[PDB]
Structures are given as structure tokens and as C-alpha cells.
Amino acid sequence: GSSGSSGEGLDYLTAPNPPSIREELCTASHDTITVHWISDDEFSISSYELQYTIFTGQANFISLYNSVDSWMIVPNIKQNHYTVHGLQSGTRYIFIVKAINQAGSRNSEPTRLKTNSQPFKSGPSSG
């Protein structure tokens, strides 16, 4: 990913810039996942919002995504990585970081993430 030298900056603030959910930085644990979101301008953002939901294969992505109200939300996020607790081993989980500022909010693209088989074994395990 050769880095470049260019600056534009969306003169518009009506809406908070969309965050970049890094999959290389994000981690997956037995029943815990740590999603990492990188942003260039988060000064306006008064607070971040995390939205995660279990993915199995609903009739249609639209149907589910439709009743977002159901989706889980965890406000009070003032970091660049929030560890979600209360998941299931070996299960799909879609995360969506929505930046919120004085203007409005910006929903980022859905980032699919899976957890690890099982947690660390205590006892029967050699390497």
C-alpha cells in the first residue's frame, strides 16, 4: 500500500467522515472480538457508535438490515477499538461503525468478522 502525498479534506461537515474498519488490525476471540476503525478527521465526531449483529443467512440481507432497530449498539465509545463481549464461538458477526458529530452521523460499510474455534486451553495442550 504505497503511501502518497495529497490533501483535499471534505470542506463539507454536514456529515461526519466515514470510518475505515481495518480487518488487519481487528482481532477475533472465542467469545470476544476487537474491531479497529481508522479515521483521518475525528475531531468533529462527538462520539462513536458500534453496531454488531449475528449473521447466519436471513432470507435477504435487506430484510434483516431493514429492522436495524434490532441490531445491537454500544455508545460511549471514545476509542479506536472496542472489544465486544458476549459472542458465540465459531460464528459470523457483522460490525458497522457509525461516526456521530454535531452535524449528523455516517454509517460505514458492513465488516464481516468471525470468532475463533475455542479459547485458550488450560491443561491438556502441548506445543
Side-chain angles (χ1 to χ4, degrees), residues 13 16 19 24 29 31 33-34 42-43 52-53 57 63 74 79 85 112 120 126:
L13 183 150
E24 66 155 87
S29 204
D31 59 40
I33 295 178
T34 318
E42 67 201 87
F43 290 72
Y52 58 110
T53 190
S63 304
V74 173
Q79 65 277 24
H85 284 243
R112 297 210 271 286
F120 306 97
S126 67

Side-chain angles (χ1 to χ4, degrees), residues 2-60:
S2 59
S3 186
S5 178
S6 293
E8 298 76 62
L10 28 151
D11 152 79
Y12 94 65
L13 183 150
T14 163
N17 64 325
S20 274
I21 295 173
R22 299 305 77 187
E23 293 189 46
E24 66 155 87
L25 306 179
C26 82
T27 61
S29 204
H30 33 282
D31 59 40
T32 28
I33 295 178
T34 318
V35 181
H36 293 230
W37 50 82
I38 185 88
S39 304
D40 289 299
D41 279 293
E42 67 201 87
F43 290 72
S44 204
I45 305 177
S46 208
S47 52
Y48 270 106
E49 192 165 312
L50 191 69
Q51 301 194 7
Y52 58 110
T53 190
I54 292 168
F55 193 90
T56 62
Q58 195 74 294
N60 191 248

Side-chain angles (χ1 to χ4, degrees), residues 51 64-73:
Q51 301 194 7
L64 160 80
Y65 200 45
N66 210 287
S67 280
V68 81
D69 203 86
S70 196
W71 283 58
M72 271 87 66
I73 300 89

